[PDB]
Each structure stands twice: as structure tokens, then as C-alpha cells.
């Protein structure tokens, strides 16, 4: 009676966002690359997702003891049948793993370590380097001091994160 709550009209009506035709977002070629949350006014310091593993116990510290959840160690359907993945993770697999395809290795393969090579397109365009190593089955090349990024080597018993 001292607080003030008027019912928000969004819970009454929640139409789904319009889906894209052929994944073509009609205005990519017009508008900027600014994140829409930023221009909308949405910002956050921490995003704490309770579906993460670490946060799991407080996820179970916020619920009621009265609500039971069955099938904790067993499953009604037998899980040892081979049945396929849902489709978008199949797509993740395919996009990540392309070199499993037949004949993905390039025919009479030219690039061998020690050759001096220009970068034709993308970042580092116009840079000459020497081929250090060849990863052949991926069709990939390591070129000397081109595309140099950080590698995180995690902490352990004796070492810090490098």
C-alpha cells in the first residue's frame, strides 16, 4: 500500500522479433557497426549467467525446497542409442571442422617452408615474409612475423598465467 506497482503491458503481449530473409539484414550496408545495445542505452558491468557451472549452487540456493526435480541419476529414455545432434550444432561442427571434407587438401601443393611470400588480401596486405611452418591438411601456413597474436598459457601448480 506504500509501494507503487502498475502492471507492465509487455507481459500481456510479447510478439517474437521478425526473422531475417536469407539471413539478410536489410540495413548492414547502410548503418554503422555500433552494437545496438550501446545505442539503445543498454550497458552492464557484470553479466552473471546462472546457467553457468560455477554459479550453480546459488541457483539452487534461490529456489524452494518444496519443488522436487526427478530423474536425477537415471533417465526415462535409454541414452545409449545413436541419435543425431540438433541441427545448429551440426552446423557449428561443419563450420569449425571443414577439413574433414573429401579432397580438402589442395592439389599439387606448392607451399613449403622457407619460401618468401607476400600477403595478397586481408590484414597484413602487402607484407613479405618467410614460411615458417606448414599445416597441410588444413590448408594453412605460418608466415614469419605476420598474423602474430597472443596465446594464453593457463595457471597450474607451479606456474602463473602467461
Amino acid at each position: 500500500m506504500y509501494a507503487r506497482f502498475r502492471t507492465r503491458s509487455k507481459f500481456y503481449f510479447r510478439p517474437a522479433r521478425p526473422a531475417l530473409a536469407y539471413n539478410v539484414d536489410p540495413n548492414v550496408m547502410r548503418r554503422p557497426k555500433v552494437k545496438r545495445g550501446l545505442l539503445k542505452g543498454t550497458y552492464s558491468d557484470e553479466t552473471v549467467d546462472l546457467r553457468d557451472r560455477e554459479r550453480l549452487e546459488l541457483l539452487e540456493s534461490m529456489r524452494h525446497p518444496r519443488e522436487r526435480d526427478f530423474y536425477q541419476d537415471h533417465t526415462y529414455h535409454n541414452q545409449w542409442l545413436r541419435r543425431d545432434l540438433e541441427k545448429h550444432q551440426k552446423q557449428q561442427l561443419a563450420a569449425r571442422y571443414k577439413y574433414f571434407a573429401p579432397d580438402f587438401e589442395i592439389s599439387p601443393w606448392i607451399w613449403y617452408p622457407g619460401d618468401i611470400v607476400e600477403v595478397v588480401s586481408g590484414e597484413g596486405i602487402g607484407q613479405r615474409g618467410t614460411i615458417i611452418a606448414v599445416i597441410k591438411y588444413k590448408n594453412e601456413i605460418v608466415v614469419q612475423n605476420i598474423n602474430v597474436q597472443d596465446v594464453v598459457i593457463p595457471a597450474s601448480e607451479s606456474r602463473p598465467e602467461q
Binding site: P113, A133, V134, K136, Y137, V142
Partner: protein, 52 residues
Amino acid sequence: VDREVLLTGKSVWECPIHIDHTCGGSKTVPPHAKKPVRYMDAGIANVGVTDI
């Protein structure tokens, strides 16, 4: 192997795993199988053409 190559920098020539592209279906095909010889095929590829 990806991680290890990224670290050590060694070049890798052959794939560390064997890929059966038939997903275990090539064992279904009889062992003496070979494709027949096809004559006068439709295509432009046997004409080596670099510029068109």
C-alpha cells in the same frame, strides 16, 4: 594437435587422424568394386581451359 602445433611451431604434413568419408559405409561396398569406364562424357572440363 592444434594446440600443440600452435605452441611448438612444428609443421604437420599428414592429418593426425584417419577420416573415413563414407562414415563406415565403404565397408558395405564389396571389396572388388571399381567404377565402369564412361565414354564420351558431358562436360567442358577435359578441355583444359584457363581463360573463360
